Design a protein around this ligand. Structure first.
Ligand code: MG
Ligand code: MG
Lengths: 150, 150
């Protein structure tokens, strides 16, 4: 019945242009600059979903997106929010914003200087680390946004 | 309401003893030899779940399990079955079966000679491949068990 009982399936992608050392950032009015991505449709694969969402949100067609981790947290009544995290360096197309947010190429080394969504930097660190694959909020108490990286 | 509307969260782990080149296999009366693992509890992280399930099913405590892919397929009415796939080479303990299946160390090169669960070999191949991370059944028709690897 309640929203806190649901399992929500979403994705994000770190799209990195190796020629320019820039990454696609999206501005979402949690608030701030974050990675683009979206919700998984009922019939589509996880990889199909990230390719489709990225195309819609950025105008870019990514190839062979790589699974780099999972961000997730329990909801209040047995539910869970799930973010499947991808990295893509192979893509084509022209960058184009959508109603879902303004997108831009930001120099990767300048990402920390933006108004970032909460925990963007440790999330990007988990994704980039070859030996880490999960970012979890235990949500042990109602205000607990402490994280665990596995 | 129906079981085909649910999102089911499970894990498996390929536990490889690098000293002996054996892998833990579990016999489940889909039927056949498969990897051990289990269902994710409401409050636990994905990594916590695989460590706990593997301990219960095998007696081994795995350390630092690595995400190597996701096996998944849609269910008939908007649901999805999800298997988070891990590999672990660091562990301790003594192998011990449980009510959930007999476990054994099988030489990795002898795995194909077992009565394996359906698609075990391509699943293991997806997991072992550094550039593949999803095993998906589109379930386009009712008898369609064709697969896609991303
Ligand atoms: Mg989106
Ligand atoms: Mg099990």
């Amino acid at each position: 019945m309640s929203r806190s009982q649901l399992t929500i399936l979403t994705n994000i992608c770190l799209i990195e242009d190796l020629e320019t050392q820039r990454v696609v950032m999206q501005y979402r009015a949690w608030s701030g600059y974050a990675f683009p991505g979206g919700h998984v449709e009922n019939d589509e694969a996880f990889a199909e979903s990230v390719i489709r969402e990225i195309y819609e949100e950025t105008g870019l067609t990514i190839q062979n997106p790589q699974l780099v981790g999972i961000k997730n947290w329990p909801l209040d009544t047995g539910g869970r929010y799930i973010v499947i995290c991808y990295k893509a360096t192979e893509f084509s197309g022209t960058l184009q914003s959508s109603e879902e947010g303004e997108v831009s190429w930001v120099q990767k080394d300048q990402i920390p200087n933006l108004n970032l969504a909460y925990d963007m930097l440790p999330l990007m660190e988990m994704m980039e680390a070859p030996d880490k694959s999960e970012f979890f909020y235990p949500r042990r108490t109602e205000d607990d946004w402490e994280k665990k990286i596995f």
